[PDB]
Structure formats: C-alpha cells, structure tokens
Subunit: 264 residues, 4 copies
C-alpha cells in the first residue's frame, strides 16, 4: 500500500481545440481556443496579450501572433484575469520567448510566483510553471501601450487578485467599450466560514456590484460560454453575448443558491 | 485534433512505499521510502532534514518525525541534494507546516524557486510546488546545527547545483564520517555540445574526482540502489553499500560509455 | 557638474534611542526604542515579533529577547504593520539569525520583496534590505502561536498592505484586548488623483472606519506618540493612551484638512 | 547614546561625471560616465546594455540611448558583469522604463534579487534597489540578439557570479574581438580562511587563467582605469589599453601581495 501517484490537470477537449484569430474589434483579436479566451490587442507600439489559457497553448498563441503579423519581441505586455492554470499557464514560457512584461496586482503576482501552488481552494492540485510579475498595478490604474489605455478594476472572488480589464477600441471608426471581466464562479469553494478566506462573501458580493458598473458595450470572459460567446461560429460569436448586468446578475443568483445549499 | 493533455510525473511504486525510521548512526535516521532517501538528523538544538522525495511524501515524513519524538517546529533546517521533483518535492509544504529554513547553493536555489520548471534537460515535464531558499551556501561552507557540522561539497553534473553533504556522527560512541553524495547520472541528457550546458562534461568529470576525495566511512545516495543500499531489509541495509571510490568509479564508466554512444 | 550622491535615510535621534523591555501585558513586551514600537509576545510554544523598526535595530532586538529569556530559534513568527524602512528594517537580518517566519498580506509581501524600493509615494528614497514572506495571510485570518490567536485586519492607506493586529492577553489573570493598529498618516502623499493609487481616498476613508470597529481595550501604534504612548516613562507609558475612536477620529480630521489644502 | 544612523554609499565624483556616447566599434558604444563603464550594443533587432553603474545613472543612460536613436522599448537585453551597487544600480529602474530582460548566472541572479544586501564581504553597506533575473545563463552559453552573439565566461572572484562577456564586432568592416572582463580585485576581502567563501583563492586563481585565455583584440573593464582606458579623452581612450594577459598578470601580482600581507 504505497503513497498515491501524482495526478495531471486534465480539462475538457474543447478547452484545447485550436482556432484561427477571430476578430472582435479593429484592434482586439481572439487567438486562444474554442473554450478558452486569449485576447491579442495590436497597437502601433507593440502588442498586448490578455490571458493565455492552458500551459500547453504557448506554441499555438505564437502561431496566431505570427498570423497577425506580430513578432515575438513585439509582444510588450501580458495582462492576466486571474493566475490559475487554465488562464496563466504559458505565461512563464511566453516571457522567455517573447521578451514581454507581465502586469498584475499584488495578489495575482504572489499566486503567479508560486505557480498556482498552495491555492486557497484547490491546494496543489493545479500547479503550472511559475512566473514573476514585472509591474504591480493598483485598483483603477491605467496601463497605456501604443495609445490604447487599459484600466484595471479589482473584482476579488474567484481569486483574491481577480481583475477585469476595460479599454476602448473601434468598430470601423466607431468606438466600442470592451470589458474583459473575470469569472464570478466558486466551483466547490467553501463560502461560509472559510479560514483561508474569511471575507470571501464580502468580496464576492462587492465584486458583483463592480461588474455591473463597468463601462462596457461588448463583454468577454475567460470562459466564453460564461458570457454566451460562441468562438466556434466565427462572425456570429458575439450574437447572444450577455451584458455586464445580466452576467453579474446571473452569477449572483447561483452564488446565493450555492451559499444557501452550503448552509444546509 | 486538439492540443494534448497535461501528463503527471509518474514514478515506480517502490519509490512511494513508506517505511519506518531505519537507524543509520546514533543521530542519523532514514525516514523516507524504500527507494527514496530522506535523512533526519536529531541534535540537542533541533532537527535537520536532508531531501524529502516526492511531493506527496510530506505527511509521511511528518509521521516518522513524530515517531522519533520531533515536533514540526523542531525541524530547524532542510538541506537538499539537488532540486528535482523526486527529492525536493514536499519542501514547500514542509516549510509551511514546520517553520524550517532551507539552505542551498545559488543554482539549487533558483531551480527551487521555479519548482523544477524550465529544466535544462527535462523542460517543464517534472514541475513540483516551488519553494524559496532562506540561506545561500558556498562551496565548502560549514552549516552547524546543535553541534553537528554539515560541510557542503559542490558536485555539479546531474543538476548545476548538485551538492554532497558530509558530517560526522557516532556509532555508539565510535565516530563515523557519513557522506550523502548526490547522483552522478545523466538519464537521457545531451552531453556533447549542449547549448543549455556547454561545460557539462567538465563539470561531470571534475565531480567524479570530488566524490572520490570526500571524507567518508559510510556512503548514502538519494537513490539507495545507486550506492547498493537496501532500505527494505532493515539492519542489513548497509551490507553491500559501496565506497566513494567505487561509487564514483562505476558512475564514470557508464558516463564515458554514454558519452561514447552519443558521439555515434 | 556630476550626478548627485546617494542619500541615506536619516531619522530623529529619539527613534534610535534603545530602551529595556517595558511590560504591556502578561505576555506582550515593548523591546524597541523610545519612538519606534517593536512588540514581543511570549507563548509556551515560542515567541512572536510585531515590527522591528530601523534596519540597525537588529542587534538591539536580540539583546532584549535574550533579556526576556528567549533564544533566537525561539522566535517563531514575525508580523508586520507595514513594510517601510522604519518598521520592517531588520526583518531580513532577523530571519537569518533567528530561524523565524514572516507572515504578511500580498501587498506587504511584494513591498518587502523589493526592500521598500519603488515606493508609491517615496520612490527609492527609503530602501532597506529585502526579505521574503513565508505565509500569505488574508483579511480576518487568524494566526495562532502557542494558543495566542492573532487576527489580521486590513487597513490600507499608509501602504496598500497596512495591517492592524488584534489579540487578547491578560493583565494578571484579567483578560485584555490589545489592538496594534498601523499608521493612518499620509506624509506628503498626493491624495487626489494619484496615478499610482487611484482608490487611495476610498481606502483611507474605509480604513478610518475599520480602526474604530476593532475590539480593543489598549491601543498601540508603530509610532507611540501617534497613540499618546510615552515609552520613556516606564509604568506611566499607557497613561494618556488614546482609544480606537479617538485615534481614528483625530487621524481623519487631519486627513480631510490635508485633502482640503491639497485641492487648493 | 543612540544607535548610529544609516550611511549612504558615496563614491568618487569622477564615477558620476556624465559623458556623451564614445564609440568603441561599429556597434558598441560607451554611454556611462568617465570612471564607470556602461556598454551599449546596437543591432538590427534591438539594443543590448552591459552594466549601468550607480543607481542614479538611469536617466543619464536613457538620454544617451536617445542620443543613439534607441527608444526605451528597443532595449531588449541587460547583461551584467557582477551585481554590485556601482554596476547594477539602475537595473531595477531600467527594467520598469524600457521593457528589457536581464540575463545573468545563478549567483548574479540571487545577489541581484536581494539588491546587494547580505554581501559576502560588505554586508548591507552597499544596498541598491533589487531586480530579478529573467534568464539564467550557464558558463559558455551563447546569447544572440540581432545576429551578435554574446558568449559568457564565468570568472568568479570579486563576486561568486562575476562574468566576462565576449562578442565580435567590426572596425569599419574589419572584425574585432571585444572582451568585457569583470574586475579581479579583492578590496578589503578576507582571502585566507573566509567562512563565507572557503574556495575563494581557488576561484580567484582559476579566474586569472580564464581571463588570459579569452579571445580578445580590445579589452574593457567595468572600471576603465583597471584596463588603462581613459574615457575622458575621446578618440585616444583605447590608446594605452591593456591586453588580457597584462590585465590578468597585473591583477594576480597584487592578489598574491595582498594574500602575502594577509598571512602576516
Ligand atoms: C482551475 O480552473 C477551474 N477549475 C477546474 O478546471 C476544475 C474544477 O474546479 O472543477 C479543477 C477553476 O477556476 O475553478 C475552471 N475555471 C472556471 C472559471 O474560471 O470560472 C470554472 C467555472 C471551473 O473550471
Ligand atoms: C527527475 O528524476 C529522475 N528522472 C526521472 O524520474 C524520469 C527519467 O529521467 O527517466 C523522468 C532524474 O533525476 O533524472 C530520476 N532520478 C535519477 C537520479 O537522481 O539519479 C535517476 C537515475 C533517473 O530518475
Ligand atoms: C518612511 O517613514 C515615514 N517617513 C519618514 O521617515 C520621512 C517622511 O516621510 O517625512 C521620509 C513614513 O512612513 O512616511 C515615517 N513614518 C510615519 C508613520 O508611520 O506614520 C510618519 C508619520 C512619517 O515618518
Ligand atoms: C562596491 O564597489 C567597490 N567598492 C567600493 O565602492 C567601496 C570599497 O570597497 O572600498 C565600498 C567594490 O566592488 O569593491 C568598487 N569596485 C571595485 C571593482 O569593481 O573592482 C573596486 C576596485 C573597489 O571599488
Ligand atoms: Zn480559475
Ligand atoms: Zn477557469
Ligand atoms: Zn534528479
Ligand atoms: Zn532522482
Ligand atoms: Zn511608514
Ligand atoms: Zn513610520
Ligand atoms: Zn564591485
Ligand atoms: Zn566596482
């Protein structure tokens, strides 16, 4: 009767199904997979990447960046929604091969430094290669690259450093306010009386209000289905996409239902 | 045709077979498994741990420490042979639950900081929870805990920070010089013209001479079979144990055979 | 006309005036200087240090710990109010010479990692030896050492990771709720429209309410004069000491006065 | 009688005397001060910086980079001789304002992480803002940027991670092998029986032989006077410049003289 073997982080096959760059606005592109969002913004002074998905997506992201005419050293910045394995996986590998810098809040930085290990809810079950944060950003701080300003909005809940990024692009000259909000889910989390996260409910509730107030005309999420995006249908991907209110209102109802069943 | 799934680091079942503390000398104890060495030294001022094996061995090591009458906060120091997954696995978890400090050279420290990721030979295939080094030690530096002096001897080869630790204990009053030398193997390594390790052959050859010169009366290795230790037979474990010369002489012959076949 | 020379962080002479351990409660002791608070709590399972002052106070703190009958390896934990040079200075040196662990929130951890450099308000003017955080604590998390429970209360303002620690001791059997609240000052800070800290006013105001609500019978601050403590008079030190309300009410009035004059 | 005040790292005024870019070869430029070497190499794919001097030289280096027609985001790499305050000072500030990556060996990386604190010989007397190493390089590893290959040669002595960088440039079409060797001095070091550096003499002696064997036609050093460079005379700067043999032969004679007087 020996000690058990290590277990690998296995996900759905749709999370790893590669797709070609699907255009969102004049400057924003989806270069991830069908069920994992990885946003690429092209400016005149370089490129900015928002999330990257699973650790084995590094080569696929570089192929799509080459498809958009972007060299590795043209990726100037890497922004994260939250530092979990299915979103900040290839960050370490992408920093070594692109010469890019990662900006994240202090809570996302410390979790990125230990590669998702010692997670508040998952422990060491979802460990990915660790990376370091080059620039610590605060709540409401503006990050400007090539004229495009990225505003951070702290929405702690899924992780203590969960962050929503808001910027303004164009839809053929016509401006558009895009909001890439992080997840509001608590899969298997202990909400009531968690010794590792005592103020979790206060952070989740306040984050529900933060998402509703974001300046947004088109919403995206790290998991496209959570905001009713269908990356696999191309042009009609944003057809049934939700609003900030509907996304936060739906996520809050299932949080209170989960909170209610947890008390029983 | 999606991207492949992550693969877990699977080892032989004998590496995870727990055993009770097997006494080596008056103060040194083997508290690991049958095929993974984890040494515990008990002093009057606390305990010192040398290696820990696989990441899922943390609880087993604490159980054997409790069996020897050692509290978690009595573990003062954690010494490493080299920072690979099958030897420094539970180091991060053991630091959180014991209040111990880790001493290692700069090369072992940087590899421990990124949890075995970006390995020179294995890449990201063997990633374990990352840990930090509290004290950077140099070649030949003496680390003293409770009167027992631990002398470090840099033997780079398997890893750039591979280290052999030498201390003197007692066999019922009679002193004994114990040498815990690291591995001299290169499993699947590219020896000739490795762009990640140009001076690898020079480091391996010089490390072969360093092991032969160690002051030793009883030799141990992170893998007991590499020094002909048989932990599963109790008292007769050190029966056929090798010497420093025989251990370095045998490891060098298979290095030159591997070097010869690699050129062809 | 060459570039200017480096300038050292000089403080008032009263900040560096050493004093003997002044007893606060049955287990809490003041072992710092006359104008810099460094609290020592003695339990049956080890000692806990709260702040340490200037970097050159490391030897003085160890002398007072020896005066209280505490060995270096008996210091189990180091807690911080905020990671500035005049409070977390000797933390790096104290970790090397005591075998202690440092617990701090993510914001205090990242500032401690870069040794106070790249400060939001002071830049690189107040740099001290860097240290690492061993345990990341969340808001409201309980840290227990030897039965004495330390509850953290995030009060961001002076620094993004400013923290107040609350524990219950005894005054000769009679229990007492002691609250070690951090500073609420903003010396020379830009409050309105600070690009490095956009939500500073919201954090300061909410921290004013957090201090008023702390369970406290005896209040202490990193600077004793800020809470009307007079360490230099021994027994009568806590004579004119303020309450949580009076301390937060006074600090808020001068914040609004500073905010008013800044707008003009 | 209070504790002493902190002391700032003061240097000679000639170390901080700014100068204009002085051309060395077709691609290598000196953009530091009169007595502190900071080399800039311009390629078609970006720029590479070798050392930077004192921490307050960051703005001056960027001004000279702008003088050479190099944008901040065009600085791709920062290479270090050794991680002391008078050579890796502005590295942290230059990483934040240029988007560059730092490559260094493990020993230079760990010393850069703690900002020169806990020095083997100087303690905490020369602390500078800490920085992180993005890429760990090994002995003899080739670092290529824009076609120009930089070969690292470990020469431990002044610091455990002292490194000499060798690359080949052109003198108007005519190739030239430039070697930027680190210092071989031991100012006030304890050579014989240093508990923090037991194998120091073995490292110094072997580094003396490593410098003599470097492929070099024009030698430079972090301190120009150490290799008989006179940056203040423009074209005649390399007039009396030494060779690799003469530089290592002279440094070894004063090492043995220092070693001889230390024994007495
Ligand atoms: C770590 O990745 C998530 N969990 C898992 O993959 C697995 C699990 O928890 O069942 C383990 C997670 O974050 O919880 C992922 N992410 C999200 C999300 O981001 O909302 C949702 C929804 C759950 O699946
Ligand atoms: C990482 O662990 C080792 N390798 C493996 O477990 C697997 C492999 O390489 O086949 C992967 C390794 O270090 O190479 C282990 N360790 C030793 C050793 O320590 O000598 C020997 C011999 C090989 O097995
Ligand atoms: C960094 O130390 C403080 N500032 C200084 O020492 C100097 C300055 O700012 O004038 C520089 C600071 O934190 O602002 C110290 N600390 C506190 C405090 O902790 O409230 C008060 C009040 C100001 O003096
Ligand atoms: C830290 O900077 C050096 N020392 C000092 O500036 C001062 C000192 O040591 O006297 C302190 C040093 O490295 O020793 C500098 N650097 C070199 C060198 O690089 O060789 C030589 C020669 C001494 O001066
Ligand atoms: Zn997640
Ligand atoms: Zn997810
Ligand atoms: Zn190994
Ligand atoms: Zn192994
Ligand atoms: Zn302060
Ligand atoms: Zn202060
Ligand atoms: Zn130096
Ligand atoms: Zn120098």
């Amino acid at each position: 009767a020996p000690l058990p073997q290590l277990r690998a982080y296995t996900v759905d096959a749709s999370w790893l199904q590669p797709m070609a760059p699907l255009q969102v606005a004049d400057h924003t592109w989806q270069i991830g997979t069908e069920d994992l969002t990885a946003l690429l913004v092209q400016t005149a002074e370089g490129a900015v990447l928002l999330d990257g998905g699973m650790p084995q997506m590094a080569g696929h992201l570089l192929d799509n960046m080459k498809l958009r005419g972007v060299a590795p050293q043209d990726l100037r910045l890497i922004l994260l929604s939250h530092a979990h394995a299915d979103h900040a996986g290839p960050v370490a590998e992408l920093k070594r091969r692109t010469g890019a810098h990662v900006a994240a809040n202090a809570e996302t930085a410390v979790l990125l430094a230990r590669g998702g290990s010692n997670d508040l809810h998952f422990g060491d079950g979802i460990t990915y290669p660790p990376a370091s944060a080059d620039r610590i950003i605060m709540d409401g701080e503006v990050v400007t690259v090539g004229g495009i300003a990225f505003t951070a909005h702290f929405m702690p809940g899924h992780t203590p450093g969960s962050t929503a990024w808001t910027w303004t692009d164009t839809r053929d000259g016509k401006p558009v306010r895009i909001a890439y909000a992080d997840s509001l889910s608590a899969p298997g989390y202990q909400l009531k009386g968690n010794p590792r996260y005592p103020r979790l409910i206060e952070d989740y509730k306040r984050s529900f209000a933060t998402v509703r107030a974001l300046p947004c005309d088109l919403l995206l999420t790290p998991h496209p289905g959570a905001s009713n995006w269908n990356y696999a249908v191309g042009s009609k991907a944003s057809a049934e996409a939700l609003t900030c209110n509907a996304y936060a209102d739906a996520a809050e109802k299932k949080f209170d239902a989960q909170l209610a069943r947890e008390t029983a």
